[PDB]
Structures are given as structure tokens and as C-alpha cells.
Design a protein around this nucleic acid. Structure first.
Ligand code: K
Ligand code: K
Ligand code: K
Ligand code: K
Ligand code: K
Ligand code: MG
Ligand code: MG
Ligand code: MG
Ligand code: MG
Ligand code: MG
Ligand code: MG
Lengths: 178, 173, 153, 214, 56
RNA sequence: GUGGGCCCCUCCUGGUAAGCAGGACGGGCGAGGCGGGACGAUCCGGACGCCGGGCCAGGGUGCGCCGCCGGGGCCGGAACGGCGUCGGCCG
């Protein structure tokens, strides 16, 4: 026998490959995984992991959030491994270069009409595979409504709302309401 | 298997008592690791110096010449199931360590006392006239003769490979 | 147990020490306390207001609040597989300034002091767990000869 | 390429270092067991003793298995890297290590190794930990690549550092995987060596105990 | 019939299996329970420091 | 899924006691093969993929039944009795 329990923890499971059946996702992930193994750049390593994520870990990005984040560094390439949607509450857009997995039809029309460019990750792969003058960006992973009900509403330090409809008063008017 | 050792020891020196006293003992043990342990068993009782608080300066091993047969007198104390006792024993052997082998086997056999139950107080040579035990004294004489005390032992031993024979052998005496 | 009130099982720990009854000396109120300081909790059994529960006697914590009359102390407390950070409010008679980091401030001051002095080579400033002794000579001119003694009963 | 030139030159530089250090260390080992002799002798002309230095390294062997161990015993044994019943390690001596080892005495036996015992263990049972892998130690090319920052370049530098308990003992000692020795010969596994048993402190008698297990 | 009342025999081993957790790093600095008269003056001081103020 | 547990070592409480009943740190059986304790869920060793070689823990070595010789002694259970035998201490 051998004692391999004390001071040793249980191993970990993480996504090491995309589970999408889309052939365009497999082709791109397999390609950027190759560039990492021949470059050792940590930009191509973070980007290879973003392409394995599960679509609740890949929230969207709006143009107005990009226009805000890319301010004062407007000569750089925003890189987003998700969809770029449109924000109609912003009346005027600036000129910028964005590379994304997918563009909405209305967001593409606005980006181009300002003088910007809409790149794809295979355009990025050919011209800038190691991320020179590129910035990686993502949206708010905790914006989902589902992640707002996690926990124990009813416990005195919760700050979470219950799930159904509750029409009573008992425990719902603060402490000393039970 | 017993061996004679001389051990030196002393309390660790401090500010109140620079240059503490040195204590030496003669020990009989099967090796150097048992002997140093037995030195700390006595220095803890007689002088109240635990092993944590002192250091051992030497474990001298002494080899004795044999070649002649002398008497030894051992003053010891041992423990039984009802208390503690004193006892004097005499033996004839060729070196002091061999005389302590003989003592430990007689204690183990007639008193059922083991090595760590026994404390040796004294071990000295005893001149022929001064002996006090009958068994030893018989052989401290001129011209002692006896016939062989067990000649059957020779014949049986040969009969362990010579398992079958044609006559029952004799025992010459 | 069968009975578990707030001051149960307190017959000895809340009692006063021999010939140490009466009012606390006035250093209890002239000490200055600061945010972030370490303190010990020791219950004085003659002062009944702001007196912490018996669990907290003999623990060490850190000040998080300085109030007009009482101090706020944070205690790490183990509960059944996790540690909890507990916050309590205790009056001055049950708090004493703690020296748990006294040894560490003396060493940090001593290393920067002995660096300033340079002894041209910098001395080794790491603490050393006691090493085995080195080789040396000792005299045996005067040596005592002991032996086991006889049983006396 | 330039890789084959540097690897050609480097090994050559390491090899001539191996013939320099071998002869000097052989000189050192003869000289110790001499200087003590002249110092014990100067002791005799006076009424004086010579008390030498205590051990600085121990060799520790595990002699009991894994069924039924208590929690504080099994944590101490894992920090010593003694996870299997016949494994052996080298170990530094100070009050931190000595007081932990006395807690697990009935599981272990230990003492002071010679430079001959150290040499046979490394040359015959020596493997290396490299990126978490157990790699056979067969030549000076692997001791240089891993330990050159601490000025250990050949097998006889590793032996010298372990025997003298020098400046880089921690890194020299952890480079070795724990020794995987053959099964031991015991009198009485459940008794201390000073009662005729097998466990605990046994001094210089550790050298013939492991001799048959290497 | 009667069944067992109480034991804690296996409970220290269950308590240790996932390690003994530690409280969040941010619980050590929670404002909950501090003097309000101190927390008021803390906000006021920063709002009027141009290096710290976050007013538009 | 579980919320009938039980046993060992040390430490305890009720009871004349119990293979009785109730608590405590650590370990085990439960849910742990293999060897040994003649025989046993828990004792002594040792914790397990399928093989070949070597070394040997615990217990042992007249024949059943794998494996031994040499050397020194002696020859279930209470109060209480013994000029059985060998060895001591005090007078
Ligand atoms: K709910
Ligand atoms: K509690
Ligand atoms: K009764
Ligand atoms: K088990
Ligand atoms: K009798
Ligand atoms: Mg192994
Ligand atoms: Mg836990
Ligand atoms: Mg029962
Ligand atoms: Mg069951
Ligand atoms: Mg059987
Ligand atoms: Mg047979």
C-alpha cells in the first residue's frame, strides 16, 4: 500500500475543448490552439480558452459599451469572443475596428457607416495571430436574471428575492415579522 | 554478547555553574546504544540530570584478556511481583563480561527476571580463599576430578543423521 | 448539561483571584486604544455591563470599532467545519492590550538597526532553530564515580 | 546547430570538473578521520576528553504500514515524505525536525550515515524529481542541468553536500525522489531498539540495517 | 423501543474532510456595526478631496 | 444516498453483576481481498489490475503439516495450608 490521501486534493475538471457541433467553432479553436503551442504567447492562450466557454459565460457586448471602453485608445483592435449587438439609445457612434464572433445585422450597418471595420476571427488569425495592438474584452458575466435568485431568501443576511408569488406577510416585513 | 563500557557525562553548563562536575560509570550492555541509555537511567535517579539537560562525553569500550579462570562476585538488586530484593551471586568465568552473561541467564531462569528489571551495584574479583558459595568453591581447589556429567549427549547427536543402525550404541564412561 | 443559560458553568472562571477583589485600578480607563490593535479578552467578574459570553474568555482579536464607552472586537471562531468572523461590543474592564506581535516588532527594529551599523559584512538575520552542539574539549582531572545503590525497606 | 555546440562544450567543462572535485573530496574524507585522531590523542596527554560534533544529517527508514494511523502521526510522516513501508529519506537535524520525529518514533528507525552508505544509495537507488516525474539518475548531465545554480555539477558534489549538510542541503535533498528499498529484516517491529526491538534511534547501526536493503 | 440519544464520534472527521474553511477576505473590513458618526465623517472627507472625489 | 449502528484501546456514569444499559479523543468492521491467531464481521501483520523472479512482516519450525539447530538455568481460579525441589535476605 501507499498513502496518497494526506496533503493531496481531488483533481479538477475544466473545459479543454468546445462542445458545440458548429464546424466553424471547431476550426477556429483548433487553429488558435496550434498558434499557442508554437508561440507561447499568453494572448493566444486566453483567446483559446474563451472559445471553449458555454454561452452563459459569453455574454454580449453593445456598441456603446465598446465606444466607452475604447475611448482614448481608438487606434486599437477590440477583440470579442461573443456577439456584438446594437444600442439604439446612443445616437452617434465613433469610428473603430472590432473583431467578433458574430455581428447583428443592425450593428454591422452602423459600424461600417461610421468608417469602422467588422473583422472575423479568421481575418484576425491571418493578420494578427498573436494579438499585437489588440485588446481582449468581455461583457458582464453576472447580468443574467437567473443568477439573481441564487441563495436563501428568508435568511437575515441574504439580499435575494424569492422565486414564485408570495402574497402573505409572515417573514416578509423585516425582522420581527415571523 | 555482553560488553564492558565506560561512560562519562555531565549537566549542560550554565551561568550559575560554569564547568559542571563530570560523572563516570562502568556499564555492561550488548552494544553502545543500550549502554548510553542505561547511563541516563542512573544519572537521572542518583543525580537528577535528565537526558534533555546533559551530554555524554565518551562511550569507552574495553576489551579484556581471558586465558585464565577467576572468580567474580556480583552485588545486584532486582524486582519481583511482590517488591524489590538484594542478592549476592558468585560465578567462575574468564572475563567480567562473560561473568555477567552467566549471571543474566541464571536470573532469567531461576527468578524469571529480565535485563531491565535488574540494577548492578558491584562487580569484583574474589580470591580463592574468600569465596562464600559452595558451588563455586568446589572448583577453587587442586586436583578436582569428576566423571563426565552427561556422556549420553554425544551418542544422541550422532544419531540425528545416522537415523538407522544395526546395534544399539554404548555410552563410554 | 440539561440547563444552558447565559452564565452557566461559570463558577470558577468568573470568580476573582485571591486578594484581588474590589474596583479595577484606573489604568483600565487611561489606556489609549486604536483601530487595528490586538487585544486579549479576560472577564472581570465584578463588572456586569458589556460583559462578554464565557466562550470569548481567553481569546485574542482585533479592534474594528472605537465607541464612546465600549470597544468592538473581531474574533475568529470555529463552527463545525468553518471559521466565522464574529463581532462583539465589550466594555473596558474586560479588555487588555495584547503583546502577540511584541516579539515581531523588536526583531524588525533590530534587523534594520544592525544593517545600519554595517562588521562590514552583513550578519545573518534569519532566526535559527537550535543546532546540534559543536566539538569541544572538557577536563576529566576531577571525575566523580557513582553506581546504583541498594534497596532500603 | 548552436545547440549541439553548446551541449558539446558544456559537458566537456563539466567532466574536467568531475575529476577535480573527486580527488579533492577523497582528500577531505581521509583528512577528517585523521584530525580527530590527533585531537583525541592531545586529549590523553592531559586529563581531558575530546567531545566531537553531533550528527547533522539523519537517514530515516519507515518500518510500519498504512492501516490504522492517527491523524497527527500521518501528517508528520507525509512532510518527511515517508508514504510507503520501506522508503528512506535523508533529513536535517535541528530542534524543529528532532521534536517532530520523536512523535512518530514507533513508525520509523533512524541514525547517522557514513559517506559509503550515502554513495551506494545514490549510485544504485538514485532517481530524480523533474517536473513531477521520477527520472533515473545515470550520469552527470542531469545533476548539472538542474542544480548548477547551487554549484552542484556532478554526482560527487551531491554526495559531498549531503554528507556535510551544507548551504544548499534543502535543494540538494529535495531533488532526490524518496528511496524505494527492498524489504527489511526485523527482530520485533513493536519494540524500541534499546529494548531489543527495531524502532527508534539506532545510531551507527543504521549502516548495516540498510546495507542489505540497497 | 429505545434508540441512541447522542454521539459526536465521527464528527471531527467530517469537519476536516474539506479542510477548515476561512471567512471571506472582505468580511474583515465590513462597515457593519461601526459608529455612524465615524462613517459619516469618512464619506464627507473623501467627497471634498480632488484626488479621491468621484463627483462628475 | 444516509438520519436502527456496532466493536477495540484508553477515560468515565447507573447497577451485586452482565456477551447489561448510557457518554468521550483516536482507530476499525460496516463498505477491506491475502497470511497468521485450530476454529470467529472487528484480535496480530499487511489494504487488493493480470503474470515471472527475488526479499521477507506477523506467527511459528517431533508426525499429521510448509520450516531448527547450538548454549545457560528450572522442572480458568481465591483466602489459606506444604520438613517437595532449587535459589536468596536478616540475625
Ligand atoms: K423561493
Ligand atoms: K456554537
Ligand atoms: K441492581
Ligand atoms: K474502512
Ligand atoms: K518454596
Ligand atoms: Mg514504491
Ligand atoms: Mg471542512
Ligand atoms: Mg450490547
Ligand atoms: Mg447496512
Ligand atoms: Mg484459517
Ligand atoms: Mg516435515
Amino acid at each position: 500500500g501507499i498513502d496518497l490521501k494526506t496533503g493531496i486534493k481531488k483533481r479538477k475538471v475544466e473545459r479543454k475543448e468546445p462542445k458545440s457541433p458548429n464546424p466553424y467553432i471547431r476550426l477556429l479553436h483548433n487553429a488558435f490552439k496550434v498558434v499557442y503551442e508554437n508561440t507561447g504567447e499568453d494572448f493566444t492562450k486566453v483567446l483559446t480558452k474563451r472559445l471553449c466557454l458555454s454561452k452563459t459565460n459569453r455574454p454580449v457586448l453593445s456598441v456603446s459599451r465598446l465606444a466607452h471602453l475604447m475611448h482614448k485608445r481608438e487606434d486599437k483592435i477590440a477583440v470579442v469572443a461573443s456577439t456584438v449587438t446594437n444600442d439604439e439609445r446612443l445616437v452617434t457612434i465613433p469610428r473603430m475596428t472590432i473583431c467578433a464572433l458574430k455581428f447583428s445585422a443592425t450593428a454591422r450597418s452602423r459600424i461600417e457607416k461610421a468608417g469602422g471595420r467588422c473583422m472575423s476571427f479568421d481575418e484576425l488569425l491571418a493578420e494578427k495571430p498573436t494579438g499585437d495592438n489588440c485588446v481582449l474584452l468581455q461583457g458582464r458575466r453576472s447580468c443574467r436574471a437567473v443568477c439573481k435568485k441564487f441563495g436563501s431568501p428568508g435568511r437575515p443576511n441574504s439580499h435575494v428575492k424569492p422565486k414564485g408569488e408570495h402574497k402573505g406577510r409572515r417573514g416578509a416585513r423585516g425582522r420581527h415579522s415571523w | 554478547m555482553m560488553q564492558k563500557y565506560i561512560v562519562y557525562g555531565r549537566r549542560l553548563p550554565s551561568e550559575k555553574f560554569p564547568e559542571p562536575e563530570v560523572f563516570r560509570m562502568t556499564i555492561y550492555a550488548p552494544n553502545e546504544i543500550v549502554a548510553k541509555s542505561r547511563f541516563w537511567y542512573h544519572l537521572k535517579s542518583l543525580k537528577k540530570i535528565k537526558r534533555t539537560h546533559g551530554e555524554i562525553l565518551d562511550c569507552q569500550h574495553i576489551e579484556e584478556n581471558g586465558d585464565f579462570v577467576k572468580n567474580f562476585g556480583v552485588l545486584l538488586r532486582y524486582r519481583s511481583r511482590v517488591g524489590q530484593h538484594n542478592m549476592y551471586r558468585e560465578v567462575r568465568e574468564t572475563t567480567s563480561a562473560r561473568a555477567m552473561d552467566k549471571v543474566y541467564s541464571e536470573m532469567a531462569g531461576q527468578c524469571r527476571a529480565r535485563y531491565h528489571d535488574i540494577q548492578i551495584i558491584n562487580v569484583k574479583e574474589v580470591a580463592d580463599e574468600d569465596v562464600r558459595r559452595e558451588k563455586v568453591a568446589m572448583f577453587t581447589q587442586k586436583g578436582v576430578r569428576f566423571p563426565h556429567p552427561c556422556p549420553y549427549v554425544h551418542v544422541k547427536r550422532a544419531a540425528r543423521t545416522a537415523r538407522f543402525q544395526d546395534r544399539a550404541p554404548h555410552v563410554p564412561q | 448539561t440539561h440547563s444552558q443559560g447565559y452564565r452557566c458553568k461559570t463558577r470558577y472562571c468568573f470568580a476573582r483571584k485571591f486578594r484581588r477583589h474590589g474596583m479595577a485600578n484606573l489604568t483600565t480607563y487611561n489606556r489609549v486604544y486604536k483601530l487595528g490593535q490586538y487585544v486579549n479578552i479576560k472577564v472581570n467578574g465584578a463588572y456586569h455591563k458589556g460583559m462578554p459570553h464565557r466562550y470569548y474568555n481567553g481569546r485574542t482579536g482585533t479592534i474594528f470599532n472605537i465607541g464612546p464607552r465600549a470597544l468592538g472586537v473581531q474574533i475568529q471562531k470555529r463552527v463545525r467545519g468553518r471559521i466565522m468572523l464574529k463581532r462583539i461590543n465589550v466594555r473596558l474592564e474586560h479588555v487588555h492590550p495584547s503583546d502577540c506581535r511584541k516579539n515581531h516588532l523588536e526583531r524588525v527594529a533590530a534587523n534594520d538597526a544592525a544593517r545600519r551599523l554595517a562588521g562590514q559584512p552583513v550578519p545573518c538575520l534569519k532566526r535559527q532553530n537550535a543546532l546540534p552542539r559543536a566539538a569541544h574539549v572538557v577536563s576529566i582531572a576531577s571525575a566523580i564515580d557513582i553506581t546504583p545503590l541498594k534497596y532500603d525497606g | 546547430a548552436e545547440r549541439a555546440t553548446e551541449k558539446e562544450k558544456r559537458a566537456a567543462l563539466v567532466k574536467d570538473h568531475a575529476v577535480k572535485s573527486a580527488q579533492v573530496y577523497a582528500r577531505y574524507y581521509i583528512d577528517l578521520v585523521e584530525s580527530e585522531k590527533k585531537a583525541r590523542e592531545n586529549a590523553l596527554k592531559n586529563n581531558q576528553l575530546y567531545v566531537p560534533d553531533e550528527p547533522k544529517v539523519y537517514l530515516v527508514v519507515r518500518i510500519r504500514g498504512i492501516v490504522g494511523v492517527a491523524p497527527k502521526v500521518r501528517t508528520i510522516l507525509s512532510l518527511l515524505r515517508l508514504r510507503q513501508i520501506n522508503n528512506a529519506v535523508f533529513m536535517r537535524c535541528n530542534k524543529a525536525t528532532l521534536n517532530a520525529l520523536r512523535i512518530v518514533d514507533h513508525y520509523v528507525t533512524y541514525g547517522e550515515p557514513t559517506v559509503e552508505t550515502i554513495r551506494n544509495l545514490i549510485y544504485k537507488r538514485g532517481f530524480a524529481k523533474v517536473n513531477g516525474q521520477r527520472i533515473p539518475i545515470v550520469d552527470n548531465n542531469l545533476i548539472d542541468e538542474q542544480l548548477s545554480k547551487h554549484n552542484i555539477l556532478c554526482a560527487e558534489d551531491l554526495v559531498h553536500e549531503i554528507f556535510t549538510c551544507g548551504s544548499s542541503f534543502k535543494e540538494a535533498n529535495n531533488f532526490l525522489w524518496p528511496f524505494q528499498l527492498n524489504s527489511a529484516a526485523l527482530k520485533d517491529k513493536r519494540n524500541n531498539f534499546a529494548e531489543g526491538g527495531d524502532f527508534g534511534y539506532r545510531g551507527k547501526y543504521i549502516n548495516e540495517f540498510v546495507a542489505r536493503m540497497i | 423501543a429505545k434508540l441512541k440519544n447522542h454521539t459526536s464520534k465521527n464528527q471531527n472527521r467530517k469537519d476536516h474532510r474539506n479542510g477548515i474553511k476561512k471567512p471571506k477576505k472582505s468580511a474583515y473590513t465590513s462597515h457593519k456595526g461601526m459608529c455612524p458618526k465615524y462613517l459619516r465623517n469618512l464619506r464627507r472627507s473623501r467627497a471634498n478631496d480632488p484626488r479621491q472625489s468621484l463627483r462628475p
